[PDB]
């Protein structure tokens, strides 16, 4: 029956939108983590680099 065919297909289209949202909510998380990590290594690269350059400076001073 053309009505119930359509009722199936719609509900089924409704499924397709749920999935698509859920996927996006996963992706945004995925991408968050990625940035978060990048930013952390940055903070420690900076500091260590500095702590190096200055330390050795104190070696010279001796």
């Amino acid at each position: 029956s053309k009505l119930e065919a359509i009722l199936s297909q719609e509900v089924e289209a409704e499924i397709q939108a749920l999935l698509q949202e859920a996927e996006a909510k996963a992706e945004a998380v995925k991408r968050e983590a990625e940035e978060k990590a990048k930013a952390l290594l940055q903070a420690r690269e900076r500091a260590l680099e500095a702590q190096y350059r200055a330390a050795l400076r104190r070696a010279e001073s001796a």
């Binding site: 952390l40 290594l41 420690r44 260590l48 702590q51 190096y52 104190r58 070696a59 001796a62």
Partner: protein, 60 residues
Amino acid sequence: EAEAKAKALEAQYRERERAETEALLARYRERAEAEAKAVREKAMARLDEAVALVLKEVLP
């Protein structure tokens, strides 16, 4: 494992640092050691006259 990256950062930072400073004093010190001798050796020369000079001044 991003914490791992950061850990790894430490390694080299601590290691190289150690090594360089550990060398640094030694090398410098040994140039000091060198220079030190060479100024003694300068001194030798200008030893005798200083005393001669000094000796005359005090006497009266």
